[PDB]
């Protein structure tokens, strides 16, 4: 169905331990394709997915340029924000950048994104119009004004609506076999008695792609929120994902409970029952 | 492909 390209940048200052660490990660939906680490020996944008390795020297040259540039801007930006928020040199601080684009099954532009966070909390965000910013405080307002003078939003719009979608459409073509496959979950059920009167029913979904799944517990038609426990979608480590959902049931009432599994790769929504 | 424009101080 729908596809997306996301870029996650992290900058952490380290007082009296040297200059800050920059980490860059690129994704095409749920698959990582690029990596950059300011502490790595290479000091280059490195491939992580097989289908990106085919890109020439010019590609890795530009990608290294852009990340080195952001890396360098953040080193200054950490002290600048430390200034705005009135914080001492002793204390570790984080700057996180999230940006990218969304396209549909037709491969047509849907949305552009640009968000910034200081110490894990919202700092400055580019609105859906890609024409204006949203400052979260008086400090972020100083940046807004600076980025207003710099004509940042206009420049951000040019990339997010243009090159971002061009690159994403290109990645979908080159990595067709892995990026465009819909692997359905291999579903099964387990029973674990916790008492003589109480029992635990667990519903598993394994080896599925994309990570977007739904595991709902039902009892004689109605939904179950009370006594329903879910783990967050975890990576298998081989490009697939895993997830389970459990519910504590009274012994003998196992046939009253059903589990509905929903996935993009699954033709019809699966219903599992003990 | 990463963004290279704009990369201005905040």
């Amino acid at each position, epitope marked *: 169905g729908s596809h997306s390209m996301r870029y996650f940048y992290t900058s952490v200052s380290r007082p009296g331990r040297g200059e800050p660490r920059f980490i860059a990660v690129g994704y095409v939906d749920d698959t990582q394709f690029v990596r950059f680490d300011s502490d790595a020996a290479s000091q280059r944008m490195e491939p992580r997915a097989p289908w990106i390795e085919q890109e020439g020297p010019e590609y890795w040259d530009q990608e290294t340029r852009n990340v080195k540039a952001q890396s360098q801007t953040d080193r200054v930006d950490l002290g600048t924000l430390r200034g705005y928020y009135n914080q001492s040199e002793d204390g570790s601080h984080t700057i996180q950048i999230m940006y990218g684009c969304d396209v549909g099954p037709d491969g047509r532009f849907l949305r552009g994104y640009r968000q910034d966070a200081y110490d894990g909390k919202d700092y400055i965000a580019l609105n859906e119009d890609l024409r204006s910013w949203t400052a979260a405080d008086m400090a972020a307002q100083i940046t807004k004004r600076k980025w207003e003078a710099a004509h940042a939003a206009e420049q951000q719009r040019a990339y997010l609506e243009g090159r971002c979608v061009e690159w994403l459409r290109r990645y979908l073509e080159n990595g067709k076999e892995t990026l465009q496959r819909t692997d359905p979950p291999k579903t099964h059920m387990t029973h674990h008695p916790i008492s003589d009167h109480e029992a635990t029913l667990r519903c598993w979904a394994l080896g599925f792609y994309p990570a977007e799944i739904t595991l709902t517990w039902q009892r004689d038609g109605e939904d179950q929120t009370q006594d329903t426990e879910l783990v967050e979608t975890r990576p298998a480590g081989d490009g697939t994902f895993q997830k389970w959902a459990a519910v504590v049931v009274p012994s003998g009432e196992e046939q009253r409970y059903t589990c509905h599994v929903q996935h993009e790769g699954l033709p019809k929504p699966l219903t599992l029952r003990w | 492909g990463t963004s290279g*424009s704009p990369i201005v101080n905040r």
Partner: T-cell receptor
Amino acid sequence: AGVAQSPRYKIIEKRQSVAFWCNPISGHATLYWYQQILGQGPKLLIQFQNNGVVDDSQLPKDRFSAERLKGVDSTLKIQPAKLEDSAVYLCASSLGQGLLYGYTFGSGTRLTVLE
Amino acid sequence: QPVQSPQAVILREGEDAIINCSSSKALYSVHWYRQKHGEAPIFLMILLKGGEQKGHDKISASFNEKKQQSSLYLTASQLSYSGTYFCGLGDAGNMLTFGGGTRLMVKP
């Protein structure tokens, strides 16, 4: 104020050292160093984003070196200078990167390396 | 990397001059600079996808995304128009790569 560059002209002897200074437009995050041999097109040497290097691939690491330690003014050094190094050393500045931003060049340093 | 054409031009005052700049790969931004006797390159116009058609005083310029070419139009040339014009090129970060140049001579 404009982009400042010291000196305007410099005569050096083949095998001696030389240093070129450059002060960009106050606030400008990006600083560039270009070498223009004769009337030809300026050839990039080094790019700086704030205090650090973005691209130094074009720098002959054997003789050339450049720093911008506090991310304001920059210095380009040649040690040792070859006759081939007789050129105008242009310094450019921009607010950042950049697609809407045009460069602001300084007057440059005219260098003549002599036998 | 960008192909600047022609390398040189001589024309009478009031004649039209058209100088173009071509790229092998897709364009980002096209920079245009003017340079005099040992002077600093002075910025004229910057063209990109936003537009495309720009102007500086009495000189106009084009950006053709499809053709991967940009042109500088010097209509009714004045003695002040000499001498060297440079076409510079994009890069995703705007890192400029200058063309060969164009020595323009306006004879009175």
